[PDB]
Design a protein around this ligand. Structure first.
Ligand SMILES: Cc1c(N2CC[C@H](O)[C@@H]2C)ccc(C#N)c1Cl
Length: 249
């Protein structure tokens, strides 16, 4: 079980936000803490990505790009898992010290986005996603969004993507002696992965708008954070960079 060995070995651990839970909730405090958390999550995703099997076959610039474009979706995906495993998807488990009840969902002004994120979280339970299915799915999320004009070396990317699809296909939980079982299972997981992208887009839009008006609402954006949001995210929001869907929408 070599592939799965790697994924579990490299799976990040706990990442705290730094948030002061003894102060009364407020938009600026909430979003500042999420942004700091995004910065911290980003560092970890970078190290995780680079330790992935076959990832360094990618050209150097494609590596950072692929990381930057997928960063939100990957965060959202793993955050839903934490929420699923730690609170049965009742609240959003961004970090041990940053857990969103309904009131923070409202005070963050992200209620519509949070609702979608919680739905994804509930899907892990509804589908009974195994932890092994989660790891391969998350690995695959990293290779699910590219420039329409293509990467610097697309061949190596397509090869990686193909192989991560195959690894996901090997490990799906199904009665192998029944073809219909595994077909259905695969369909569902492909559908679930597809459902991360619209959510990532809504978040992309929110953070982008938030960044533009940050100097009025008093929200802090960390350095790597703001680089990504001002340079990479608009390529997504403008159609230059699109998600690879399994199923046509
Ligand atoms: C959506 C999101 C984060 N967003 C929410 C909006 C904010 O601009 C920030 C980038 C931050 C951290 C995690 C985690 N973990 C997640 Cl899932």
């Amino acid at each position: 079980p070599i592939f799965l060995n790697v994924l579990e070995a490299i799976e990040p651990g706990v990442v705290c936000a730094g948030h002061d839970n003894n102060q009364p909730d407020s938009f600026a405090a909430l979003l500042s803490s999420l942004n700091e958390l995004g910065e911290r999550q980003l560092v970890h995703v970078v190290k995780w990505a680079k330790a992935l099997p076959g990832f360094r076959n990618l050209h150097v610039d494609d590596q950072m790009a692929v990381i930057q474009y997928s960063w939100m979706g990957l965060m959202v995906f793993a955050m839903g898992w934490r929420s699923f495993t730690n609170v049965n998807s009742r609240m959003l488990y961004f970090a041990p010290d940053l857990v969103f009840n309904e009131y923070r969902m409202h005070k963050s002004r992200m209620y519509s986005q949070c609702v979608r994120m919680r739905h994804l979280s509930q899907e892990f339970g509804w589908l009974q996603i195994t932890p092994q299915e989660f790891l391969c799915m998350k690995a695959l999320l990293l290779f699910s969004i590219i420039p329409v004009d293509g990467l610097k070396n697309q061949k190596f990317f397509d090869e990686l993507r193909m192989n991560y699809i195959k690894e996901l296909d090997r490990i799906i939980a199904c009665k192998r002696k029944n073809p219909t079982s595994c077909s259905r299972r695969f369909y569902q997981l492909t559908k679930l992965l597809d459902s991360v992208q619209p959510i990532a887009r809504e978040l992309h839009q929110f953070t982008f708008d938030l960044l533009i008006k940050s100097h009025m609402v008093s929200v802090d954006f960390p350095e790597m954070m703001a680089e990504i949001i001002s340079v990479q995210v608009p390529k997504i929001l403008s159609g230059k960079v699109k998600p690879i869907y399994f199923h046509t929408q």
